[model samples]
Target chain A: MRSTQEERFEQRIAQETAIEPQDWMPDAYRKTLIRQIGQHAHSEIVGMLPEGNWITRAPTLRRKAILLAKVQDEAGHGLYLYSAAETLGCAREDIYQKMLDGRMKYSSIFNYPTLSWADIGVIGWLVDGAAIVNQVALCRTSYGPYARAMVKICKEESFHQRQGFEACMALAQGSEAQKQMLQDAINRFWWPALMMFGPNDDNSPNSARSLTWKIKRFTNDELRQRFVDNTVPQVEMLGMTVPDPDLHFDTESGHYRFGEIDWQEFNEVINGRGICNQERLDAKRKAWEEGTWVREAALAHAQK
Target chain B: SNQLTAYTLRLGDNCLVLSQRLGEWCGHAPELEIDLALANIGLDLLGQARNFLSYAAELAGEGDEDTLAFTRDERQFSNLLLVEQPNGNFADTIARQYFIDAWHVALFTRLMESRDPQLAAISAKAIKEARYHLRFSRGWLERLGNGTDVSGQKMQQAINKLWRFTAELFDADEIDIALSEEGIAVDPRTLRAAWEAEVFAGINEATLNVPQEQAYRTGGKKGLHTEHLGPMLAEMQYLQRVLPGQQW
Candidate 1:
């Protein structure tokens, strides 16, 4: 009942063979890769704003240094994603312009501000921790370039998580003020990190087809659950409490069943009305607008 | 030991403060690649700051690099005034960078021949980076200078605004005087000719005018800085100041 091309695509998916750029694929499949990969690339670029908030205010020289490398890594990741997306036959400049025009969407996790030194640590530990778990699952994604990029990204994501947790350990083991700072940071970032997984499994649009195509390895809820299960003990190890009072372990399920995520807030944050949404977007556009000459100059220089 | 610590602190402070400035540009630069490039350069400066400050700490024999970096009042800091100048615009940042990078290349090239092995080794590593930094800054300088009418104007204005602080890069203070005599440091005055030669050529090649302003500014090496550095240090040192003896 299937055409030869369609059957071959499914067979490749079933066999776990990467879907290379040259392979025949359905129009929808190509669109999915373009959208998902574009959004992923923009997320890495937009994600820099929160961490940038603390680079100068980072507590220690070592912390400052780590934060700098981490921010740079985000840039590197963004570039990697852009290159990956380009393999799908999309122009990077056009996609970047679409992002500036607010036509493209990035991760909503970056809409929050980093208000403290502990914030940098929390972002690295929680946000990136959450991202890595999801991305680790994505390493098996069908698209060849994206899966390869994820493999490279996953390698650095662990370094980010370790640095983040290491930073947390310093505060957790420090004086009372340090402990309080760490607690406050956890209180603020916990909910956002949870929301980073997006709406939920049943609510995810076209996630079924995505999994069918092997573009997504697991449902969003499954990744979220795994991240929560892995993080609760680390939070305990930090001597901090999760913001969710209802967050607890279920012996029957052998999982940490956290409370309901506030999708209402997530929606508001995702719909361009979050605390830092306008600020982040404006910040990005301003950089692009002001940089036109610099970009022009570079291109002009390259020709000479 | 006091002179060595002072000398090292001066070098360390320059890198430390400038690294902070570049770090502020992350996620905010005109281009994403530019943002990463700035952060990469900042990382390099931070590494150099760590090396110099660590050596200074060993010389003092009482405190470590963090203590010197975080504990110092603004009056105790000794970065060049040019580096601490605010990043006004992209052009201004390029202007400041070109000024410092040219000088850094000149100073570090000779400093690598220092009689002190530690200083020589550090300079040997730093000179290569400084050469790269100069290439970047100079590239931008030419681009902004030779581009559109508006860009050319902004580039010139940035150069003019930052020209006053250029003098301090070559000021031969007592620290430099003593260190140069011992062959442990490149004399600031001796580096002036080479710095000017490189910098003047960069400006000319970029089609920018040589600023006619007199080179009179000097004080940062003596621990006196502009109003900018105090506020910078206040933000930088606030967490450490409040949580004394804290590890992070």
Candidate 2:
């Protein structure tokens, strides 16, 4: 029933190849990538403040160096994603301004504070591990720039996950005090890391549409399931139990199913009611106001 | 030997002290990007101090970088008094950086030509990174100094408070005399005129006033430091003292 040109277009769509920036794509697909990638980039930058709290206090030179590099990588990831979003026809300034205005969202996980040095290890292991599980799936995302960025980001994230695991491993195998610190960090972070996958698929408004457009290759609940399943063994390696009481593997379906998320708390966080929300936003706003002169000077200098 | 060790300690101490000062701005920076930028710059300086002090240790043949950095009493540190000053604000941090970096760039440039190969090699690599740091800080100084009334005034105030420390950067001592004669070190006094000329030119272009020449605050070269250093060292050395020989 289709014309020759229509049939050819359909064939191209079905091939599952990369859709370049200039290519004719559906509007929904472009919008989806922008929202997701923008959030991801925002997450990277805002994520710095939490872990950055520990950099100066890192107990050793080697620990300090690794933490510094990890934080720097987060900054670099933000840069890369901002550039990727630019290819989608958005300006970096616009994205930044949106974040500053609190009109956009970053990951809800960073809303928590890093209470101890061992929390750094827990962040790397569980937080980054959760990010990688999602990012690896994003590598197959239909958009070219986003996918390419993920390929590189996922590689660095793997290193981050391993380094974090190593930190936790050291603590778990060390003194009773250190072991208690490690367990505490894991317990605090586990539930929040689960919330990172967004609302469950049945309740998530964006996932179904995103999956159909291939912008999101997995559903929210499915990705959360995947993250929970993959992370259990790693938690075992850390010798700390995951905080979820109902989290367990189902041998029959070969998938891990867990209890319902505290959607109330998750909603509170996403809506900017979490513990450090005001603090984070105030810090970000103050940063912008303070840097006004520098930004003006750079612009003036560039113009001249 | 004490004098020679004091000279090298000044070089290492200068960086370590400045790094500690800059590190104070970690969470308080005006911008997140600038926070990371300054932190990276501070870490680079710390890294430079590590290498420089380790070399100083080898030359003195008495202690390692850790002992030099941690075990030494405050009066034994020979760093210039400027770098150890408290960080006041954004303007203060940038002004301090602009002053120190200008002198550092000039000092390292001459060191690259030193007959001592280890110092020369370190200088060679360090000069490149320091040049970039200078560029970053210099950009900030020009902006803050030439901008609105409030920013310019704040920047000028920072320069005024920090200027006295600049004189001692190029103040030569007996140790410098020994090292310069042996071609192991460049005379700090010799680099003074060029450093001042360059720095003044930058200040002029930024539309900022150069501070009047004042009596130089001395004695950091002889291991004399302020009350601030003690508290800084307490926080810095706490964990290391608590867990001796602990490694991951």
Candidate 3:
């Protein structure tokens, strides 16, 4: 027996009505929105670093410009998300500081290093492709602002995934070295990309509550399975292969049955033990510390 | 035609080099908003660079923009010395950006009247971008200049360090002399006064000091760049160099 307000809120969610900012909601629901939205925003921001690694060194002028534009779009997505999160009454600065201090988490997929040019394309195709499945589901999330932000994000993400695949196609059809580079990238990014959907349904601590609140539409495994099913065909079109030798199409189930995720590695990465974890965190911290004077100066000047 | 190719390449390289420098700040800016702002400005410059470089490639008759951008050595690049300098701090980047933005506004406004239709068209498009670039760069210049004692000092120091390169922005060599007389280019010399007027007013408004006259550093026009350019090009051209003749 829940309170009337809680019951009414669930009824609205059950009726597919969005929970607007002014509406009364449970404290737990609000906190979940903030946490989920803040993490999503942080992911967009941190995700820029890996792709940015290749922007300056992109093989051609066209590729360079494309890389820059793509990275710029990620920044815009971050801004949109931060704006959406602010409607929940959490300050962007406070939550951002929490991320910088390691008290909050971003998507662990970004902690992997972008070692080659192909990694950029792989990130776009696989990482962003994986994200789209989740984001598309999130477009109907119960919170109005988050759902709206996801709608915009998902549109741009389609372009990102397409461009990434196009880039991979160029490599796939290129000389042996280029083809090899593309394969190496896919091999490294494959498992990590799968892990991006987070823990499976059974182990996912917040899945039941979030689903009940309509904050999450699909289980983590359901989304991950859908991504694999959608992406394997694309990989086949590119004449590439996923690293999973155990992957096969379950015809009866109409799904691509992939190997089990390495939960240990995923846990390690999420706990800040990944290869580029320290490097990424240090880079953000340095920028924040060094730019204190600049930020402070702007604020002071604005006050005047 | 060769001179025109060289002239266009100068404009292209200026934008290309600076855009690359700005891209380095992508995930590393002071704030998320600043991150987006810097990338937006960089993307704008990159778009301009592509147009200019593509035109130059067509005029040169041998290669495309990628060939010129990736295959060229340091000696072949003709970007302004100022744009190629390192992004020292936020103040340093703003200082370099302000100087170039002011010059761009002046130069592009005049170039829009060029007799060469393509040059005129490119400039007509570019001036709008230059105007917005100036607003962003100038806005930051004032903020940092008038904001705090530390910020003001840093801003002034950046201006002083970069002031020596301003002479080259308006230096008229044979290309300028030839093209301006034919009404196909804005003589760099004629741009100096307008650039100075805008820049001086900006500095005054920011409450910063004007740098004293110093020995001018020239030769980006002649392929002589500061030592910094080689390393930048080395990083930029690495993939192209390693996989020569391969398409990205």
Candidate 4:
């Protein structure tokens, strides 16, 4: 019913004032939020499995408790985002169905396995830290519900990030064997975390549209640079080295310029060929099968 | 007194052992959501066991939760036999949880009236949580029981396989005798009827055949358990036993 000019004007005002879901908006903005928010939700849920691999074998009871709580918080975050996305008149089930059908994409970082207990700490630190950098920007996003959810998630994720850093710190300062484990985890996780921001600015299909709508405050490269700039110092503090040999600070721009990511590897992972991709999908399918009963029961009870 | 302490250990051991069993499914669960769900539930049970055992230790005026959980030999534990049963499949785990959680809710509800205020408080809060667990497990029970033949068959198999362990639910040893005498424990035998009633109601609603109760398996109360307990204990105790008071 609205002309293109009217839609752009509404979007401009929404961007200026942080409009909620109920506010009149263009279809493009709604669709963008659906894709991004759905991907974010899927990321949080699928994120748990990799880290969950080490919970039982966590070095100590304290570590076990922290890991358990951290994984639980991820589930809670996923639910919050899914609920936020639901405000746009879409069903949570529809989002899940989209993900199951491979029509949607989560953060590509989870495709990697938690190869060791130290990998848990690395994920909490590097992976979540990168996530926080992006989410902090999202707190100011034009969509009200998504921004609010980002604010809540970012706050909790700070603790998760620090706990992981603390775990890494302990290992870095511990026995030689522990330090080796910590370094190995870092080497494996570093490149993947970089990929989480998506492809370079030129190659990112949704970047322009998302930025114009103010759905994203920065380009993929800009956020990737920001994460690198912010995290390089933290890695130094942990007494571990970053995996990228060419990773160095640029004096001209005051940003760290890292080596090019292997986009071939990225495509392979995104296309479901990562080391644990099949395993991860298989796990999800099995869980869906096993939980059929519980879901049906809840539905039945709800009807009653 | 030693016998009663050992009996208390049995309850703690049961929860601890079963928690380990469930935890094995962490990343391997059929679905990502269910993996988190089961892991979260298992953590809750482990936490509950830790608290219960710590209280038991306080009552005994010896060691703490750690010492009671890790320092004791296998023979000293007194958990119900059902808890130590292996997790055969998804259905088996759900069936076990359904059966135990049903009785647990009833037992905890009665224990809420305990003269020991601490036990009463724990039981009161735990009973509420146990209600949710029972609902969770029972819901799954009905679906698997009434669904496609493959799922229904698996559910029935889980029930039949676990039936032998049911007798220990009502088996009271010295600890139950002492605690019941002082109004600090619920009589397990008294809970059987209510538990059976609820479970049977669920079974009928789900269209699953009732599993015939088999000969009551005893011995966990007497420090006799399946061979599974040793490896579980070894894994649980490895850190604490090797490190001896190590702290994070």
Candidate with best TM-score: 3
Best by lDDT: 3
DockQ values per model: 0.73, 0.35, 0.85, 0.28
Give the range where candidate 4 chain A is weakest over 10 consecutive residues by summed lDDT: A294-303
Ranking by TM-score: 3, 1, 2, 4
Docking class of 2: acceptable
Candidate 4 chain B lDDT trough over 10 residues, lowest sum: B239-248
Per-residue lDDT of model 1, residues B64-103, tens digit only: 8789889999899999998888888999999999998998
Q: What is the DockQ score of candidate 2, to 2 decimals?
A: 0.35
CAPRI band for model 4:
acceptable
- In the range B129-223, model 3's lDDT, one tens digit per residue, is 99999999999999999999999999999999999999999898899889889999888988878998999999999999889876398999889
Return the lDDT, model 2, position A250: 89
The residue-by-residue lDDT of candidate 3 on A115-195, one tens digit each, is: 999999999999999999999999899999999999999988899789998999999999899999999999999999999
- Candidate 2, A1-304: lDDT as tens digits: 8766556544655687787888766566677777788989989888877887777566655566677678778877888898899898888888778887888999999899998888999999889988998899889887889999999998887997899889888888887778888999988898999899888777888877677667788887788888988888888876788777788888999987687779999999989999788887777777678777666655565555
Model 4 C-alpha lDDT per residue in residues B1-248, reported as the tens digit of each score? 55445545665666776776777776555555666677777777777677678777887997777777667777877677788787778889998999889988888888889887877787777787788888888878877777666677778888888888888888776678777888877667778898889888988887787776764788887778878777777766764565465333
TM-score (0 to 1) of chain B, per candidate? 0.98, 0.94, 0.98, 0.93
Best by DockQ: 3
Inter-residue clash pairs, candidate 3:
none
Predicted complex 3: CAPRI docking category:
high
Model 2 chain B worst lDDT run, 10 consecutive residues: B239-248
